[PDB]
Design an enzyme around this catalytic site. Sequence first.
Site, PDB file in Angstrom:
ATOM      1  N   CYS A  96       4.258  -0.768   3.326  1.00  0.00           N
ATOM      2  CA  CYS A  96       2.935  -0.615   2.578  1.00  0.00           C
ATOM      3  C   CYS A  96       2.405  -1.869   2.857  1.00  0.00           C
ATOM      4  O   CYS A  96       0.802  -1.933   3.452  1.00  0.00           O
ATOM      5  CB  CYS A  96       2.819   0.311   1.273  1.00  0.00           C
ATOM      6  SG  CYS A  96       4.258  -0.425   1.076  1.00  0.00           S
TER       7      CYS A  96
ATOM      8  N   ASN B  67      -5.339   4.543   3.971  1.00  0.00           N
ATOM      9  CA  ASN B  67      -3.688   4.286   3.659  1.00  0.00           C
ATOM     10  C   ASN B  67      -3.476   5.044   4.643  1.00  0.00           C
ATOM     11  O   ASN B  67      -3.858   5.040   5.999  1.00  0.00           O
ATOM     12  CB  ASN B  67      -3.702   6.469   2.916  1.00  0.00           C
ATOM     13  CG  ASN B  67      -1.831   5.854   1.890  1.00  0.00           C
ATOM     14  OD1 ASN B  67      -1.397   4.437   1.509  1.00  0.00           O
ATOM     15  ND2 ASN B  67      -1.487   6.771   0.722  1.00  0.00           N
TER      16      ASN B  67
ATOM     17  N   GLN C 235       3.592   5.134   7.689  1.00  0.00           N
ATOM     18  CA  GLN C 235       4.388   4.165   7.602  1.00  0.00           C
ATOM     19  C   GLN C 235       6.009   4.645   7.526  1.00  0.00           C
ATOM     20  O   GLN C 235       6.748   4.360   7.935  1.00  0.00           O
ATOM     21  CB  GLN C 235       3.949   3.500   6.689  1.00  0.00           C
ATOM     22  CG  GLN C 235       4.210   3.916   5.021  1.00  0.00           C
ATOM     23  CD  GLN C 235       4.663   3.387   3.847  1.00  0.00           C
ATOM     24  OE1 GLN C 235       2.952   3.049   3.315  1.00  0.00           O
ATOM     25  NE2 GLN C 235       4.786   2.945   3.181  1.00  0.00           N
TER      26      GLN C 235
ATOM     27  N   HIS D 204       1.889   0.367  -4.306  1.00  0.00           N
ATOM     28  CA  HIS D 204       1.898   0.505  -3.269  1.00  0.00           C
ATOM     29  C   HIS D 204       0.576  -0.272  -2.520  1.00  0.00           C
ATOM     30  O   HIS D 204      -0.530   0.124  -3.752  1.00  0.00           O
ATOM     31  CB  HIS D 204       1.140   2.386  -2.839  1.00  0.00           C
ATOM     32  CG  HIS D 204       1.098   2.872  -1.679  1.00  0.00           C
ATOM     33  ND1 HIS D 204       2.348   2.609  -0.462  1.00  0.00           N
ATOM     34  CD2 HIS D 204      -0.082   3.890  -1.054  1.00  0.00           C
ATOM     35  CE1 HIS D 204       1.974   3.181   0.304  1.00  0.00           C
ATOM     36  NE2 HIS D 204       0.598   3.816   0.165  1.00  0.00           N
TER      37      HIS D 204
END
EC number: 3.4.22.2
Lengths: 212, 5
Positions: free
Chosen positions: A25, A175, A19, A159
């Site tokens: 996120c 992630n 990102q 997150h």
Amino acid sequence: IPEYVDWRQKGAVTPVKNQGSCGSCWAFSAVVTIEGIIKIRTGNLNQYSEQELLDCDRRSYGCNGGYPWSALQLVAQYGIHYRNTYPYEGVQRYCRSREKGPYAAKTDGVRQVQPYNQGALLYSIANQPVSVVLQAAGKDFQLYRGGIFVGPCGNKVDHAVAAVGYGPNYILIKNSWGTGWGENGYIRIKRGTGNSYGVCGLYTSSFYPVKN
Amino acid sequence: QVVAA
């Protein structure tokens, strides 16, 4: 539900993204659950646009923050374009869906997993990738290089990430930092700890797309 | 300190 689930083995997750410096996120997280439910339901795996959710979700805050439930709702209501037609720019700009013609895919709804309940989350992950939040601010999470992470971390979730599998002692997470973070971009977080919050607050708020 | 992003 089985002992191991890994949606990458079922060919339902795309390559790990980064990102960059945009707090996007929430959009990255929402998009791996759209990519997974479209493959589960149509047999085709495609990449979808995080930039579109970042530019077009009026409830979220572009870079510096947002809600994957809000992002998931826009796609049920409207739809989403391929990542190709609306590539990631790492900067919020004008919403351009109109300019990019028709939506590539659309969803039917958004559901929330019953929070602070490990078995509820694990039953949702056995059916499709789920959006999940966690506390990612401690340098232990940031410097994760592999293994089953047990913390130390608190429950101050900040997150959004996506869960794409689980095992007897962990939940598997995609992630959006590079393929160089963690386990080629993934993290296996300890589960079955008896903490209702989950390790790093992982059972605080989890949503998934409904597609019919 | 630490919250949504």
